[PDB]
């Protein structure tokens, strides 16, 4: 094969080709193993797990910025109001296996021509599907970078203290038909996405509470109170009070999510514990963070600067890092302000409901609600997709699901792109000259490398806006930057590392609600 | 492929094939980087720049002596009065990649059969075009020589102090479809030049100020002065004074360029600073040398020996050298005396113009002009092309340009031959046995080498001169040379280096103006 | 006919339909008249003119914002790098004539069904062409607005003191075949533009003084000075000093234009007279402002804030006004910073040239030039087109012209869209009952009104940029505005007037030079 990265913009379609270079170590000395964590030490009992490690490794292209460049992304989001995937093609080729030898003086790396690697795609979704979990190991943003393929592992059911049970499964991955690749062999795979709705690539220029003609007043009469003697009073909503209007629709449901201010130091309580104050959902005797949760507006218009939600937003790294506790200057923190029309600000407990039953003696009382869930007549909007975020997720296999759109973002798929696994086939060292029945555990040290190209077909919506005035769009203004320390933003810096300077998202075009 | 260098002289065409051997290092450890120079130190603020370095490298065949030999060039310039390019074919083949290993005792070079190199031609001119700038890295004059491919880099817009701005661009070159070459693969490219006018390969045997029949006198009456009483006087130009003639045409425009004498020591002022006395043109707050400028006659007939213009001529090295301050015996200094018919000598301020308005009291006054630019009715001639000089240049992409002939020489092209880039594809070293998300920065040390053949098709004008007497032509008379120190001129010397002994140019045939 | 305004974006084409409502008064009581201004009083002798007034009136759609809306313009300039006109169709219809009667108590307006108006297009350009002069009378920006058709008048040759001469022409416009329009009649006209080059809709990301590979150094040797004894010294330009490089091309020509600072009060001299310090060009004994002149960069990168040129830029009104001395807050002042790559900043006198001839005694001297005109090897860029500016101009009918691009902007046309004239046909009042030979000068007071729709076809260039990082684009960020005083920018304000908030131009996309 050959190296081709590019994009081709057609009218309703766009094709993004990109190709990388990878390196595959031998994981676990060609051995499976059990893994668990009991809840006795460390984080606690909620952190327990049980599963297996596998000598295999896999490709993960799930994130968007694998397939797009900051210029191609800008071309998408200013012009087009929607996108969905159509199909993908991936090809792994130019595989070459290298053997390592050490005399303690130096390493000597040689190229073994006849050794192979094994690769297969999991067509029927027989193995546990780890791709939709937004973990690391994805292709790099920048094509000149060389990346390392992750090791495959999974969790099964667990008992108390992170132990196996009867339902726990063990999967042998050598029991799957696979293809062996030498130099001069390649692996190709075709895939076609199922029908999904376009992601809404447009911000909304109206609110639900004002859909009305503001000059008029209703023919529907309201209940304005009671008399001093107890007689009912009526009122007609009009342009003086538009909150009085009867309405057909209601905004999004919510669970109350605590607020936190990223910019302003003086808006946050001192020394809050994010583990205690985060929303949880419990299952099977233990409870896990509910994050990000169902999307709420992080901030609305006319709100404090820096307002956000605690574990309510996505946050990314400017450049790939292992830090585990990154500084505020090393991260890109997204904000959802574009859904503020249909989606109430999380941590605002506005919704009011009647808590008693009136009569002569008892005055009616109401109260604000911390959690208000779905009822007929509600409209909401999904979380935005970002250049740095996940493309898809696998809808769990279950008897029911409600609005199966992934909470982190992207496209819920029942048959997502399959998970493609690869390993270095083992080559044994010299056996003894008398037969031994035991397994032969001594192998030659080796690793693999090659290229992988990924071509993906997308479906876009181009629109016609009849608003007169111009619209906000994504522009790059940093002023000046210093080539002696940090290069062009969204470019290579002085040390050679690629830096994504700020988060980007798809909603720059306003459309009336 | 096979090794073929040669020339084939057809009637109106000539075909020049030549093939070389190159070596490609790994540049920058497979990393991009920003580069700049602030104006705080060194040369000054006018020297500031900003841009990027690239792991890629490229082929530059632009100079003439890549495609011709001193004998083939002589055959061209004595017989033919014009030349222009038609098409070119280049083929890079026999690529082989070699790996280097060092124990500090010695280097060990081995041949990796399965490694590749990446190569593509930039068809659409998407990357900044660095070829027309007359920098080093060109193929050698002599085919047996082995040369090194340059590293690719470019400049973008800059702010103050050599910093990036919003308009500054960063180009990822792995985003271009490319071809991978092993042993047994080759890269071929076809190109066809756009229509251009022949370069004038003829010196001119007349002057503009004498185009007339010298025996006759005009029927046009001139203004010879006024009377002692103020009455107009008339005169008829004739063979006694031929400068009095009215004329249809005027010579070339000029900016005054200072003169300097290369041969004669006693004609030059002591300790002049060439940086202060050179013509400049300023742009964007800073100012750069205007050189060579629009061509003027370096010397005319009946002028001091050694006369030339300061930064008005091209100067070359007899053999490839890095000296940065070469001695006068190491350089070939061209001289333009063949345009002296239409092109006035630079630094001669001859042109005279009226600076006031006469009346009874005021006598008419005139003055000489330092700068006299284009007006209707002017004729000039372009700078000569030399065996050692550039073939073409890329006309900038702009709304207007006036007589877009390159000031250094050759053929201005809107679609020049594209820039062809190549790099060694990276091969990683042994990764760790536990997954790491970071980019893998350790690679195997390697380099590439191969052959490249360039075949170019030319279009020539053969002429018929009806002058009776013979013409000057390019002949080789050095007398005798010493094989013990310097070999045949235009040949290998004692140390094995190729030496170009004197500059050559295309205008040896006289033609009346 | 019917009312249709809209735009249709096709791939390489876009169609803009817009329709207005106009009102035509009776000009001059149906009489021609001579007009002149002698130079005896007022502005001076340079202000003199002579010509005629005409009862006719005409349509002028020349400006861009007649055909585009701020949203349609944004859609053009962010996506497309070029535009040129193809054809236009105009239709004037629904004409109705109204008669006015006054008893001094009140006016009474009645509708005369059988009266007509006269209209013709000037196909052969027989009348003097007044459209390319950027005067008022153009269609409004906002379609709901009603506008008044201008009166037609022209200037002819003049003697001293603004008097007619033999060459002066008088044109009778009733000598042109015309069409009479009642209610139920319409006038349609087709036109097809001649071939013109696309306007460059892209800013430039490189400079002429840096086109080079910054890592390399030239094979061309320069002249670095002379020795202490008079011997020539050589030097090789390299990455330490890139201004030393020889170059093929040179920046734009210039006439020095004085600078003025719009923002900063403290950068301007006190009480300068703009009439004395503006560039002039004289003709026929008198001299007129040269403005804007050939375009120079108003400001460059790393220059004082608010820097501009005095009468070097275009300036517009935010809303149509007669003020004649508008305040700085009522105007939109354009700035040309996007040509700073090929076009030197006006009022920077950088260009340096040799003013003498050296020898032993005389040291070489140089000087900076106030005016530096076109010479071979220059490249420049035309003035930008703006949403508020003129589309085209008529190239004068003359034997020669150099780069005939209009200095204010747009497309120079030899056969521009013809000038279309209209008048109310006169209806006489009651004549006497005995024959009189004299002309009948008493008429009925009347005016006309109707609609005019203009459909124009445009040709656009969509591009592919391979730069990695995002580009600057035109976005609307005003923060918040107050509906109680000024409405949405580029929208109707509180008083009902349409306001264009800031100037817009076509160059938002960078492209390497």
TrEMBL record, chains A, B, C:
It is found in: Virion. Residues 1-477 form the Coat protein VP1/VP2 Parvovirus domain. It comes from the Viruses. Keywords: Capsid protein, T=1 icosahedral capsid protein, Virion. GO terms for molecular function: structural molecule activity. GO terms for cellular component: T=1 icosahedral viral capsid. Belongs to the parvoviridae capsid protein family. This is Capsid protein. It comes from Snake adeno-associated virus. The gene is VP1. The chain holds residues 214 to 726 of 726 of the full protein.
